[PDB]
Amino acid sequence: EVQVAVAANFTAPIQAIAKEFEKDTGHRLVAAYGATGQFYTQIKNGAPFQVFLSADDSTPAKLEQEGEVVPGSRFTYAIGTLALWSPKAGYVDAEGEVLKSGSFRHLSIANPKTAPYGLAATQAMDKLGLAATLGPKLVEGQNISQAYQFVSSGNAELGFVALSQIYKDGKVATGSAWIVPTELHDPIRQDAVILNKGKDNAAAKALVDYLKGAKAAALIKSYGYEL
Ligand code: MOO
Numbered sequence: 122e123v124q125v126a127v128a129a130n131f132t133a134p135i136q137a138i139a140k141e142f143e144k145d146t147g148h149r150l151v152a153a154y155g156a157t158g159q160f161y162t163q164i165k166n167g168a169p170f171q172v173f174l175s176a177d178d179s180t181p182a183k184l185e186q187e188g189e190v191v192p193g194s195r196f197t198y199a200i201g202t203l204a205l206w207s208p209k210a211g212y213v214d215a216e217g218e219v220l221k222s223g224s225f226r227h228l229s230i231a232n233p234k235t236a237p238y239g240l241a242a243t244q245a246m247d248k249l250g251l252a253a254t255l256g257p258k259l260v261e262g263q264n265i266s267q268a269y270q271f272v273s274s275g276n277a278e279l280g281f282v283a284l285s286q287i288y289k290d291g292k293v294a295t296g297s298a299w300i301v302p303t304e305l306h307d308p309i310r311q312d313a314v315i316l317n318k319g320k321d322n323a324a325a326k327a328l329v330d331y332l333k334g335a336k337a338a339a340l341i342k343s344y345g346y347e348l
């Protein structure tokens with residue numbers, strides 16, 4: 122009986138971790154998907170969420186500075202990666218030269234004010250020196266999922282997506298990708314946290330002990346995350 126707030130980049134991963142979770146603990150994971158900032162606002166307004174799996178480390182810590190976090194519950198459950206991606210296999214090269222020289226008019230990022238992966242996109246465009254040239258071409262999704270769908274659907278020619286959305290057991294499994302090297306943005310450290318309303322919930326404690334387990338660790342590394 123555990124309400125879980127899940128940043129959009131971890132939509133697929135948690136649905137999968139929850140099948141084995143239910144079968145192993147008897148507790149059912151009911152999760153909501155969206156942007157980290159949106160969940161921040163909802164949690165501050167009394168949303169019933171009990172566990173918050175963030176796409177950052179900063180916002181769970183911010184909720185702890187604001188008294189919404191069980192102290193001692195904050196841990197890192199996943200480290201993500203940003204990838205320039207397009208379903209079209211010809212378009213996005215393996216050094217990502219298209220950012221510098223492409224002919225594309227639409228570039229999908231996540232709302233960088235609410236979506237950690239969107240902030241990583243803006244950071245990498247900053248340190249690449251392509252902020253002024255790429256800014257006008259940007260288009261924002263409410264969350265990283267919507268930014269990926271803008272490309273998948275055809276409303277943009279490429280976008281900065283979460284590696285979890287294009288990654289196999291080892292490999293990018295679809296389209297054309299450029300692994301954004303980590304030197305260009307802050308590492309995408311994703312912190313989990315138990316909220317005020319999970320202080321003595323057994324489904325919450327069971328879930329965060331299982332997110333540190335072996336079944337969940339093997340699934341989180343199947344999606345391209347590191348630990
Ligand atoms: O997973 Mo996010 O918070 O939508 O970038």
Ligand SMILES: [N+]
Nearest residue numbers: 208209210211
């Ligand atoms: N194509």
